[PDB]
């Protein structure tokens, strides 16, 4: 009887980790829109909101959202599906042309900028014989000057032919819910106070993941997943300095941005079922774009980052906060997408504080551009028209990107820039709970019986 | 073991009960392995690496003893080398996870001595058969 | 003429212990799955255990380890061991049947748990 | 977890005319395996242990007459009652009995008005 015998045994509960392909999915009102008004609606499957999951009792697997794989799948899948949305849209190939630009109809004052220039030049009609002369508005942020006269050219017309945001196809983020196919399982970790790091000791699986919508700023993550009781700051290594600090807090922020300039949307006919929007009047006053956050709740919620930042750094430790050090236009600025319109809004009212270990509103002014080069590719730019009236909306802030200076020669202080940077860091903040296995049955064990012949 | 309860039992649900208590649920994880313009083609290969997956478990499988048992013993002893732990002291102690890492080593030693006693048992039937 | 009749106590101090039993007349221990489920005075009714019909434990989370569910099949009863009382345990306790169709088919009485001093 | 999410707080009726409670789930308890759903609506009365009502989401419990009538599936559930008597006015329950942790209902406690 002390002689075992081994049997196998199929459907064993165990796993790997393990790299595979996960598959998009959408809401059944996701789901429901069509004639592709946003991207790929028809592509992904239709799924319930907030998928069915199970808790796994007595259980304890590690976990590391920096090591993890899904984001670079999530960011190589967002860019693809960005760029496959391109392809049924309007190359500006006519539109590289000389623009003479004289400045706006507006009281200049000669300290400052006009921020818009009024461009004409001769477009390409229907017909192929005939040229027209027609005008459009511009800003100085998409128009360099060519070397009296004053002619300019787009700022892309040495590197590409810049494709025209279709106006039919929206840039709302919508929730994916990211799939596993059969084999594989997805664990979510439902504990508390769990960095990302380590052992989590309260898993669940899930068939698919929660609502991801994907939003696009640098500094300031929007409309992401509130932490649960407190704010946790989650790095990878907090020593190393080149690494990003992601700040997620308990209450949001609620922001308010708005464009308040009534614009007027114009169509210039390029050729045969081609189409330029162009912008034709300002319609009233030439006023800045700008964003609003409340300043009693943003003084409450650096005080929480305040106090949870001094768990890592002791707590005589005097934290100051400083803007960015430089870089290009949406590495220093944080930007967004608010309905069609690429805002770049000014952080240097956020980040002025400095911390002792003892009914207002912060306005922050924005930039518009027009033409963007989202994720610095070689030769695509984009071009996004302009819209109707005056645009406004509302947000949640979520979290921070924080990055640490490189603290030598008897640092008393340790100081914090906003940055932006990799997408990655946004994309890590929602697959920071959850891994990929791959379920392997046929497991093998002794017992105390002999097949009988 | 099995009594009555009307909670779901769901898949990998007993992954950390003790693998006596986790034998009786695995035709759950049986079940829920094989059903589950350019992006049709990540669909399809990952449903033909799903049916390869079960393909190639199944083939392990019929190559041994049991091809739809789901519960097989078979006639190699287990060698105390190889865990050299009480029968007490798996079944009541440890689980599926646990069990894994701890033969992970074996493993492979073992297929190829299933293979070889279910040839030879095959051949030992044949000759049966052929001596009546 | 299944009833469920518990026992224990009711007067513990705040940060202390007590044992809560169960016994039961009208089934068979050997094939039911057995919970555990208080409600607070005035507030929902929750869960807090499930027990086997081998002895695999279930617990909420937040009783997080510091409660444990015995349940005797020899001497017939239902046992639930608290240890490191908090002042929100004040509650009625319940020990039901579980039916394979629904968990609680039936009842027990309720123990009146009061956490104070 | 799973947030079991009762839409009346209380309805206070008159009694022998119909009425009708709604429990809403977080998450579809609709078991694609068994093609079928988990609730158990329970009904508690002042200072006494609860009794169930309706198990499988659909189906009333023995001892329970033909008047009540759980309904619905996917991830919103309906209790309807056809006749009310004295001795229902107190309070139900919608429980999920899917998965871990087993989470109730808030409790809507209906009255004679």
């Known amino acids: 009887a002390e002689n075992l015998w081994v049997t196998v045994y199929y459907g064993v509960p165990v796993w790997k980790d393990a790299e595979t392909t996960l598959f998009c999915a959408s809401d059944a009102k996701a789901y429901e829109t069509e004639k592709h008004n946003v991207w790929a609606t028809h592509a992904c499957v239709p799924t319930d909101p907030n998928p069915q999951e199970i808790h796994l009792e007595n259980v304890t697997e590690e976990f590391n959202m920096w090591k993890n794989n899904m984001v670079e799948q999530m960011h190589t899948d967002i860019i693809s599906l960005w760029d496959q949305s391109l392809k049924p849209c309007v190359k500006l190939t006519p539109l590289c042309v000389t623009l003479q630009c004289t400045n706006v109809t507006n009281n200049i004052t000669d300290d400052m900028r006009g921020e818009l220039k009024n461009c004409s030049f001769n477009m390409t009609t229907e017909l192929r014989d005939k040229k027209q002369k027609v005008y459009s508005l511009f800003y100085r942020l998409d128009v360099v000057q060519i070397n009296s006269n004053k002619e300019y050219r787009l700022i892309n017309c040495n590197t590409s032919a810049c494709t025209q945001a279709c106006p039919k196809v929206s840039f709302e983020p919508i929730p994916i819910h990211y799939c596993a196919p059969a084999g594989f399982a997805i664990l979510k970790c439902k504990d508390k106070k769990f960095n990302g790091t380590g052992p989590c000791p309260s898993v669940s699986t899930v068939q698919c993941t929660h609502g991801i919508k994907p939003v696009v700023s640098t500094q300031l993550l929007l409309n992401g997943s509130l932490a649960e009781e407190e704010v946790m700051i989650r790095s990878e290594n907090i020593t190393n300095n080149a690494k990003n600090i992601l700040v997620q807090f308990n209450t949001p922020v609620q922001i308010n941005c708005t464009r308040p300039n009534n614009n007027t949307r114009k169509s210039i006919r390029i050729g045969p079922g081609q189409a330029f929007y162009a912008t034709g009047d300002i319609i009233g006053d030439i006023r800045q774009a700008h964003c609003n956050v409340s300043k009693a709740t943003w003084n409450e919620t650096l005080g929480k980052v305040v106090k949870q930042l001094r768990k890592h750094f002791g707590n005589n430790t005097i934290i100051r906060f400083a803007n960015s050090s430089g870089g290009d236009l949406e590495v220093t600025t944080h930007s967004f997408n608010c309905g069609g319109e690429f805002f770049y809004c000014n952080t240097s009212g956020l980040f002025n504080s400095t911390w002792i270990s003892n009914n207002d509103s912060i306005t922050l002014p924005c930039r518009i551009k027009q033409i963007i080069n989202m994720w610095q590719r070689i030769g695509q730019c984009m071009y996004a028209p302009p819209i109707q009236g005056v645009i406004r909306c509302v947000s949640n802030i979520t979290g921070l990107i924080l990055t640490r200076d490189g603290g030598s020669t008897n640092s008393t202080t340790e100081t914090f820039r906003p940055g932006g940077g990799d997408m990655r860091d946004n994309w890590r903040s929602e697959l920071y709970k959850y891994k990929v296995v791959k379920i392997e049955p046929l497991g093998v064990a002794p017992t105390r019986c002999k097949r009988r012949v | 073991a099995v009594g009555i309860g009307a909670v779901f039992l769901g898949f990998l649900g007993a992954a950390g009960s003790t693998m006596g208590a986790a034998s009786m649920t695995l035709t759950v994880q049986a079940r829920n392995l094989l059903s589950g313009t350019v992006w049709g083609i990540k669909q399809l290969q990952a449903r033909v690496l799903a049916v390869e997956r079960y393909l190639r478990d199944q083939q392990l499988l019929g190559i041994w003893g049991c091809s739809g048992k789901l519960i097989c013993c078979t006639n190699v002893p287990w060698n105390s080398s190889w865990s050299n732990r009480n029968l007490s002291e798996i079944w009541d102690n440890m689980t599926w996870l646990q069990w894994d890492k701890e033969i992970s080593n074996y493993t492979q030693i073992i297929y190829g001595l299933l293979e070889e006693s279910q040839n030879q048992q095959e051949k030992n039937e044949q000759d049966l058969l052929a001596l009546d | 003429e299944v009833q469920l009749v518990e026992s224990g106590g009711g007067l513990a101090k705040p940060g202390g212990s007590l044992r809560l039993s169960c016994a039961a007349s009208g089934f068979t221990f050997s094939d039911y799955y057995m919970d555990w489920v208080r409600q607070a005075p005035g507030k929902g009714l929750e869960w807090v255990s499930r027990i086997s019909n081998s002895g695999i434990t279930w617990y909420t989370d937040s009783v997080r380890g510091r409660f444990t569910i015995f349940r005797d099949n020899a001497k017939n009863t239902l046992y639930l061991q608290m240890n490191s009382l908090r002042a929100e345990d004040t509650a009625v306790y319940y020990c039901?049947?579980?039916?394979?169709?629904?968990?609680?088919?039936?009842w027990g009485q309720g123990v009146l748990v009061t956490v104070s001093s | 977890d799973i947030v079991m999410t009762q839409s009346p707080d209380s309805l206070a009726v008159s009694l022998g005319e119909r009425v009708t409670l709604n429990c809403k789930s977080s998450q579809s308890l609709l078991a694609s395996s068994n093609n079928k759903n988990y609730l158990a609506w329970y009904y508690q009365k002042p200072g006494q242990a609860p009794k169930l009502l309706i198990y499988?989401?659909?189906t009333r419990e023995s001892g329970v007459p033909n008047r009540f009538s759980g309904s619905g599936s996917g991830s919103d559930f309906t209790l309807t009652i056809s006749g009310l008597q004295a001795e229902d006015v107190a309070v139900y329950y919608c429980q999920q009995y899917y998965t871990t942790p087993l989470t109730f209902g808030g409790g809507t406690k209906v009255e004679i008005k």
């Open positions: 039901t049947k579980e039916s394979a169709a629904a968990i609680g088919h039936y």
């Open positions: 499988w989401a659909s």
